[PDB]
Each structure stands twice: as C-alpha cells, then as structure tokens.
Design an enzyme around this catalytic site. Structure first.
Site, mmCIF file in Angstrom:
data_model
loop_
_atom_site.group_PDB
_atom_site.id
_atom_site.type_symbol
_atom_site.label_atom_id
_atom_site.label_comp_id
_atom_site.label_asym_id
_atom_site.label_seq_id
_atom_site.Cartn_x
_atom_site.Cartn_y
_atom_site.Cartn_z
ATOM 1 N N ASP A 43 0.832 -1.195 0.000
ATOM 2 C CA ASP A 43 0.000 0.000 0.000
ATOM 3 C C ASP A 43 0.871 1.251 0.000
ATOM 4 O OD1 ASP A 43 -2.819 1.219 0.346
ATOM 5 O OD2 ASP A 43 -1.592 2.235 1.935
ATOM 6 N N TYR A 48 2.942 10.034 0.537
ATOM 7 C CA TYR A 48 3.885 9.467 1.489
ATOM 8 C C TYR A 48 5.329 9.827 1.118
ATOM 9 C CZ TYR A 48 -0.210 6.520 2.766
ATOM 10 O OH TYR A 48 -1.480 6.097 3.174
ATOM 11 N N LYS A 77 -2.653 5.894 -4.448
ATOM 12 C CA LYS A 77 -3.771 6.765 -4.156
ATOM 13 C C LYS A 77 -3.578 8.138 -4.788
ATOM 14 C CE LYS A 77 -3.877 4.520 0.382
ATOM 15 N NZ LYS A 77 -2.430 4.512 0.670
ATOM 16 N N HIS A 110 -7.805 9.061 -2.382
ATOM 17 C CA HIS A 110 -7.278 8.956 -1.012
ATOM 18 C C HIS A 110 -8.268 9.482 0.035
ATOM 19 C CE1 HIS A 110 -3.125 8.954 1.256
ATOM 20 N NE2 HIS A 110 -4.099 8.675 2.121
HETATM 21 N N1 NAP Z 1 -6.064 5.645 3.292
HETATM 22 C C1 NAP Z 1 -5.631 6.407 4.288
HETATM 23 O O1 NAP Z 1 -6.129 7.520 4.524
HETATM 24 C C2 NAP Z 1 -4.646 5.789 5.238
HETATM 25 C C3 NAP Z 1 -4.521 6.307 6.511
HETATM 26 C C4 NAP Z 1 -3.687 5.698 7.413
HETATM 27 C C5 NAP Z 1 -2.971 4.585 7.048
HETATM 28 N N2 NAP Z 1 -3.022 4.113 5.748
HETATM 29 C C6 NAP Z 1 -2.216 2.924 5.319
HETATM 30 O O2 NAP Z 1 -2.296 1.949 6.347
HETATM 31 C C7 NAP Z 1 -0.934 1.596 6.751
HETATM 32 C C8 NAP Z 1 -0.953 1.111 8.193
HETATM 33 O O3 NAP Z 1 -1.442 2.111 9.118
HETATM 34 P P1 NAP Z 1 -0.409 3.041 9.933
HETATM 35 O O4 NAP Z 1 0.921 3.126 9.256
HETATM 36 O O5 NAP Z 1 -1.164 4.292 10.254
HETATM 37 O O6 NAP Z 1 -0.270 2.257 11.303
HETATM 38 P P2 NAP Z 1 -0.169 0.767 11.853
HETATM 39 O O7 NAP Z 1 0.109 -0.135 10.747
HETATM 40 O O8 NAP Z 1 -1.377 0.536 12.689
HETATM 41 O O9 NAP Z 1 1.060 0.870 12.876
HETATM 42 C C9 NAP Z 1 2.362 1.212 12.384
HETATM 43 C C10 NAP Z 1 3.272 1.305 13.580
HETATM 44 O O10 NAP Z 1 3.311 0.018 14.263
HETATM 45 C C11 NAP Z 1 4.680 -0.298 14.488
HETATM 46 N N3 NAP Z 1 4.795 -1.743 14.518
HETATM 47 C C12 NAP Z 1 4.701 -2.587 13.419
HETATM 48 N N4 NAP Z 1 4.719 -3.855 13.745
HETATM 49 C C13 NAP Z 1 4.822 -3.869 15.129
HETATM 50 C C14 NAP Z 1 4.934 -4.941 16.028
HETATM 51 N N5 NAP Z 1 4.980 -6.226 15.685
HETATM 52 N N6 NAP Z 1 5.060 -4.634 17.338
HETATM 53 C C15 NAP Z 1 5.063 -3.336 17.675
HETATM 54 N N7 NAP Z 1 4.996 -2.250 16.924
HETATM 55 C C16 NAP Z 1 4.862 -2.586 15.619
HETATM 56 C C17 NAP Z 1 5.467 0.382 13.378
HETATM 57 O O11 NAP Z 1 6.814 0.546 13.831
HETATM 58 P P3 NAP Z 1 8.096 0.332 12.853
HETATM 59 O O12 NAP Z 1 7.757 0.706 11.427
HETATM 60 O O13 NAP Z 1 9.124 1.297 13.477
HETATM 61 O O14 NAP Z 1 8.506 -1.115 13.020
HETATM 62 C C18 NAP Z 1 4.716 1.682 13.222
HETATM 63 O O15 NAP Z 1 5.159 2.694 14.113
HETATM 64 C C19 NAP Z 1 -0.197 2.902 6.451
HETATM 65 O O16 NAP Z 1 1.197 2.705 6.552
HETATM 66 C C20 NAP Z 1 -0.728 3.248 5.069
HETATM 67 O O17 NAP Z 1 -0.156 2.338 4.147
HETATM 68 C C21 NAP Z 1 -3.929 4.664 4.871
HETATM 69 O O1 XY0 Z 2 -3.487 9.475 5.910
HETATM 70 C C1 XY0 Z 2 -2.597 8.714 5.483
HETATM 71 O O2 XY0 Z 2 -2.746 8.016 4.433
HETATM 72 C C2 XY0 Z 2 -1.374 8.426 6.368
HETATM 73 C C3 XY0 Z 2 -1.149 9.321 7.547
HETATM 74 N N1 XY0 Z 2 -0.720 10.504 7.250
HETATM 75 N N2 XY0 Z 2 -0.454 11.393 8.239
HETATM 76 C C4 XY0 Z 2 0.155 12.645 7.776
HETATM 77 C C5 XY0 Z 2 -0.736 13.822 7.876
HETATM 78 N N3 XY0 Z 2 -2.028 13.775 7.933
HETATM 79 C C6 XY0 Z 2 -2.532 15.066 7.960
HETATM 80 C C7 XY0 Z 2 -3.875 15.380 8.036
HETATM 81 C C8 XY0 Z 2 -4.213 16.710 8.067
HETATM 82 CL CL1 XY0 Z 2 -5.908 17.061 8.139
HETATM 83 C C9 XY0 Z 2 -3.289 17.749 8.058
HETATM 84 C C10 XY0 Z 2 -1.951 17.446 8.005
HETATM 85 C C11 XY0 Z 2 -1.589 16.100 7.970
HETATM 86 S S1 XY0 Z 2 -0.023 15.419 7.850
HETATM 87 C C12 XY0 Z 2 -0.679 11.165 9.580
HETATM 88 O O3 XY0 Z 2 -0.408 12.031 10.401
HETATM 89 C C13 XY0 Z 2 -1.206 9.859 9.940
HETATM 90 N N4 XY0 Z 2 -1.441 9.539 11.260
HETATM 91 C C14 XY0 Z 2 -1.939 8.341 11.482
HETATM 92 C C15 XY0 Z 2 -2.141 7.417 10.452
HETATM 93 N N5 XY0 Z 2 -1.870 7.675 9.188
HETATM 94 C C16 XY0 Z 2 -1.393 8.926 8.901
#
Ligand code: NAP
Ligand code: XY0
Length: 315
Positions: A43, A48, A77, A110
């Site tokens: 993803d 990013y 996205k 996105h």
């Molecule tokens: N569509 C959108 O608006 C949107 C928004 C948010 C997220 N996303 C996507 O979803 C993905 C996942 O969500 P996210 O990045 O917000 O958070 P997440 O996957 O819930 O958590 C990521 C965090 O967990 C840590 N971590 C990973 N495996 C772990 C484990 N086994 N034990 C402990 N800590 C662990 C990582 O650390 P390290 O990397 O330091 O190991 C990182 O700080 C994003 O990266 C992005 O691709 C999309």
């Molecule tokens: O939205 C994403 O795809 C990834 C992401 N992006 N960002 C970066 C930012 N999001 C925003 C949203 C706003 Cl409304 C303003 C500035 C920023 S900078 C995060 O802070 C954040 N926090 C938790 C989980 N995913 C994220």
C-alpha cells in the site's frame, strides 16, 4: 483464504505492507524484506513521498525473479490536490513513474475532499481550514474510470468515504466501474460495523488501515489509547502464544477484511506475517469488537467544514 475476490475479477492479497511514515532511508529494505517473506501486496501513496524508494525495491525483486509482476498487488492513491478532472491522469502517471511500474493493481481516491491544486499537499487559510477545490466526487470518479479504460490501472476504489459517499458513486447515472475497495481506518477501537456491513453488502472489499492503532502517528502521547498496550488484548495474545500485533492483524482477517500493517523493522515485518497459522476464537472476536470506542487516528480535522468531509455521518 490468502486473497479476496474483487468486482473486476482480480484477487487481492488479504495481508499487505503499509508504507506511511516509512522513510526513504528504510523503505527500500522494508519492501525487499516484505517481498522475501511473502507479502504480495504493498500500500503506497504519492503523499507518502517515498514511492521512488518503494519502486526501487519492487524493480530489484522483479529483476532478480524473486516474484512475478502478476503475483504482486500494488496500490496507490490520488492525492487531494489532484481531484480536478484534467489532473487525475498526470497524478497517476507520476505515481507509476516513481514506482517504476506500467500499471497499478488498484488506485484509490485517497480522501473524498478535493483541495486547491498546486505545490502544497495541504493548502491552508488563516482559520486553519483547508483551501478546497471546486470539484465533486462524481466528476473525480469519472476521471478515475478513464484510467481503467486506458490500461493504467486494473481497478479503482475509494478511501475514507462514508456510506452516503459510496452510495453517490453507486447511483451515478452512466456509471462504468463500481469502486472495488473502500480503504478505511479499522481496529478494535474503531470497529466500523455498519460501514463494513454496507460495503460488504455492495460487493466492495474493505481494507483496514492503522490496524495497530498507528502508534507512530505524529505527536502521539503515551497517555492516549494504545492498542498494542491494551492489557485485554495482551491477554488474548498470551493465550494464543502470539504477539499483540499478530492478534491485531488476525482480527480483521477474520472479518473478511484486507489489512495493511506498516513496519520498516525487518524482524516485525517477518513476525507480522505469521498470522495464517492460528485462529482467534468466536469469543475472542466478540470480545475485540466490544472494545469499539469510536476512536479515530485519522480524523482529517483541518477539513471539518469541507462539503465532502466524511466523518460527520454515523457511517
Ligand atoms: N487511506 C488512508 O487515509 C490511510 C490512513 C492511514 C494509514 N493508511 C495505510 O495503512 C498503513 C498502516 O497504518 P499506519 O501506518 O497508520 O499504522 P499501523 O500499521 O497501525 O502501525 C504502524 C506502527 O506500528 C509499528 N509496529 C509494526 N509492527 C509492530 C509490532 N509487531 N510490534 C510493535 N509495533 C509494531 C510500526 O513501527 P516500525 O515501522 O518502526 O517497526 C509503526 O510505528 C499505512 O502505513 C498506510 O499504508 C492509509
Ligand atoms: O493518511 C494517510 O494516508 C497516512 C497518515 N498521514 N499522516 C500525515 C498527515 N495527515 C494530515 C492530516 C491533516 Cl488534516 C493535516 C496534516 C496532515 S499530515 C498522519 O499524520 C497519519 N497519522 C496516522 C495514520 N496515518 C497517517
């Protein structure tokens, strides 16, 4: 199942690697390790600011014949500043160039909120609110459909859309392609039952983001809700002799969701993949669902007055 069927007939791997906040300095290795251990879904997003480094990893693994392109499922996205109809194709082509690919498996809108075009990811005014674009969701969807028709992407979808926003697309006169996927925040503190039921009823696959509660989100304090440190979830992990992360990843999989945990740490990338060889019980699943508290990590709070802000609705 290792994969879920989409409405374009492709199969989407249920576990993918997330890449938000995976720095250029570490993400190439992260993607290489992930492909090695067996992740077949990445993803990505232009916003990013690391797609070039992801692209290097993918290319190296294709060239070394570790994996075939057809076996990989690459998602990116469309950023909010490129919703204007004439900007969508260029945005996609820049992502494709950066990723060093000829096609994306899936390309998502996105956010439903268009922003003013230009160099800034977040154009802002003095009130702290975003400068919107005069675009609407249906016109942006039409531009996304043209990407399928031109061969640049195999499927299109949406992200952070509420059920009325989904509905608007589904009822669009002259619709060509339904959204294949809606990628939304989902975890035990934000279980999204109603939106998931909606999407599932419409044959739209849901991808759960932030499944570990995004502990690296900017300016998290240790006092905020922490899924990885929730003693009740640790207890479920201990009972299965698994990590808290493995429980949190397995949970969505048993709800027939796709899930995309992020890591740049090689040991965690490898350990987080070990989720196909155990099951949470019915009671486990019920218990985790009970922890819903409507807690969003990604609430897009700069945009609460945008006409297309998604989170005023119940679902
Ligand atoms: N569509 C959108 O608006 C949107 C928004 C948010 C997220 N996303 C996507 O979803 C993905 C996942 O969500 P996210 O990045 O917000 O958070 P997440 O996957 O819930 O958590 C990521 C965090 O967990 C840590 N971590 C990973 N495996 C772990 C484990 N086994 N034990 C402990 N800590 C662990 C990582 O650390 P390290 O990397 O330091 O190991 C990182 O700080 C994003 O990266 C992005 O691709 C999309
Ligand atoms: O939205 C994403 O795809 C990834 C992401 N992006 N960002 C970066 C930012 N999001 C925003 C949203 C706003 Cl409304 C303003 C500035 C920023 S900078 C995060 O802070 C954040 N926090 C938790 C989980 N995913 C994220």
């Amino acid at each position: 199942a290792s994969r879920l069927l989409l409405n374009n007939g492709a199969k989407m791997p249920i576990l993918g690697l997330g890449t938000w906040k995976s720095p250029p300095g570490q993400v190439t290795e992260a993607v290489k390790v992930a492909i090695d251990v067996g992740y077949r879904h990445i993803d990505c997003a232009h916003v990013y600011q690391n797609e070039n480094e992801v692209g290097v990893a993918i290319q190296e693994k294709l060239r070394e014949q570790v994996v075939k392109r057809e076996e990989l499922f690459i998602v990116s996205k469309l950023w909010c500043t490129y919703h204007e109809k004439g900007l969508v194709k260029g945005a996609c082509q820049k992502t494709l160039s950066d990723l060093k690919l000829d096609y994306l498996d899936l390309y998502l809108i996105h956010w439903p909120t268009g922003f003013k075009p230009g160099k800034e990811f977040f154009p802002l005014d003095e009130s702290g609110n975003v400068v919107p674009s005069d675009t609407n969701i249906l016109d942006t969807w039409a531009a996304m459909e043209e990407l399928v028709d031109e061969g640049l992407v195999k499927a299109i979808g949406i992200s952070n859309f509420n059920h009325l926003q989904v509905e608007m697309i589904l009822n669009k006169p002259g619709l060509k392609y339904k959204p294949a996927v809606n990628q939304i925040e989902c975890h035990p503190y934000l279980t999204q039952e109603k939106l998931i039921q909606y999407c599932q009823s419409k044959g739209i696959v849901v991808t759960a983001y932030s499944p570990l509660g995004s502990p690296d989100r900017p300016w998290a304090k240790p006092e905020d809700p922490s899924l990885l440190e929730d003693p009740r979830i640790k207890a479920i992990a201990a009972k299965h002799n698994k990590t808290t992360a493995q429980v949190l990843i397995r949970f969505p999989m048993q709800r027939n969701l796709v899930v995309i945990p992020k890591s740049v740490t090689p040991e965690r990338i490898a350990e987080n993949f070990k989720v196909f060889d155990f099951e949470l019980s019915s009671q486990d699943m019920t218990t985790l669902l009970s922890y819903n508290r409507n807690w969003r990590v990604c609430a897009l709070l700069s945009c609460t007055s945008h006409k297309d802000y998604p989170f005023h609705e119940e679902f």
